[PDB]
Amino acid sequence: LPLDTTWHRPGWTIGELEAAKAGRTISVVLPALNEEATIESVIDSISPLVDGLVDELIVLDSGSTDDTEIRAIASGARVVSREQALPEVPVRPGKGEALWRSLAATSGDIVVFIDSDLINPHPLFVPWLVGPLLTGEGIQLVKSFYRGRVTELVARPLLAALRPELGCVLQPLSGEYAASRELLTSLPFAPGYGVEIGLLIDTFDRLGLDAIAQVNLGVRAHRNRPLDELGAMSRQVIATLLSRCGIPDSGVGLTQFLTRHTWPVSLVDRPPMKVMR
Template sequence: MNKLNKWLKERTFHYRDFDLNELVRLKKEKNLKISLCFPTFNEEKTIGKSIVIMKSELMDRYPLIDEIAVVDSGSSDNTCTIAAKFGAATYAASDFLKEEGEARGKGENLWKALYLLKGDIIVFVDADISNIHHRFAYGLIGPLLMNDSIKFAKAFYNRPFKNAKGMAPSGGGRVTEILIRPLFSQFFPELTGVIQPLSGEYAGYRDIFEQISFPVGYGVETGMLIDIYKKWGLDTIAQTNLDLRVHRNQDIISLGKMSFGILQIFWNRLKECNKNFSMEPNSLILRQMEALAAGNYEVRETEIREHERRPMIEVKAYQILRGKALK
């Protein structure tokens, strides 16, 4: 627990911790190339703004990023046209590595981005963020450039969601709290320190990404996190608070599908590690995230032990009362 909270303290950043001039200097000094990839599928409403901001702020104003690319899953809208118009390299995922067979999903786009992009560091940012800002990229590049032992940085944020009346002040993260955190508590307790394991924004070194497999669909974030943790340990992982992320919230049916996909990937990882459900006391501690004052976080532990009662028909007093005997 102390180790986990120590990691949380040392490896949790805020995007304001990073100075862009300093990041540009470090990037130059380390002679690194950085690529930014937007995996897309019908994102014409948001892709234009995403590219414009990243290009203007992180290529023209601060030369931190060397290339911006869109890897698309076959959008039927104008996503690719708009992306190309504002200067992004656009790739249809299905046009590349055909010999590997067909698949479609965000993970497929990320996996092919490794093949298509040139960077030593690759930043993946979802293209559906309404309040896109360049912090969504540099906040993740920051930990990688500032600390040589960090190889992978993941985003977390406050997530208000849009509804019919406009903006609701809180919400989101339901799959994390209901599915992922209980699973991590039981099987990978150290990963409970990751505040939003399903966040769609992360950055890492190519030599990390190229050594792990990529689930094609919903499980890509969970699989990636577990694999990096298993291969390189918790200390190679960092997380950055990117403040506010506004996106369209998914309905419960979609979240159900997502959860089912994640479960499949999770089960595969459990099989690989030979892990079974344990009733040992330490495995029955649910670890949830608590936001403290001054923007800090702490893992809160609660033992959840489920008790069961036998069928009432087996209880002697009940049998006497009801005049029934166990058959």
């Protein structure tokens, strides 16, 4: 593949990777909205790395109203609200907002994102993801893949239509990935569920494929959302993808008939966090 792809279990040990840091730091961010059932398992999969390979782990709590925050705290995680991450700026809804704000609440040269709704995640996710950033050259972004309705019906076919160079990316919508701060604070952040696809297209347009790697995380399980919520997610993915391709989006939310309901869509990106410096 024209895309650096690690097809089998990476061979790097935790101690090698740590040596390879060479003064660089690593932050881990778990965005979370109402994931009380899974958040503790995810934090626990990663907290053993802290003060070693990982210099920092935070939960970016994105407005949870369940026990996400208390359970995360009881697992020893630093929990940061959207408001605390960036208090001069009023909070908008959606995942992209949470991730963008997380840049202001972390200081790692490398930032790793892991969804907090994962079912029994491997403790090597973070080592496997930072590998190419640490030991490669010019890699600034690493995507995960795994053995994807929105992914297989919406994002990959749309990429084939409009950015076929990215056809080799197996899981463009993957919530597990790592990237340099220099890259992330230089890119705008799409709102809502548009954030991954925006980052991928923006990264590629700006640095080309050679700046991107992907690593196999094996098998993945997570919360299965209802079709209607996916419809809304897909709508936002489309809105962001069309925008990156110079195509005007109507700005009209998807409507569904159960009576009538209109879901929000946003055509507004957050600017590169750099301007907030």
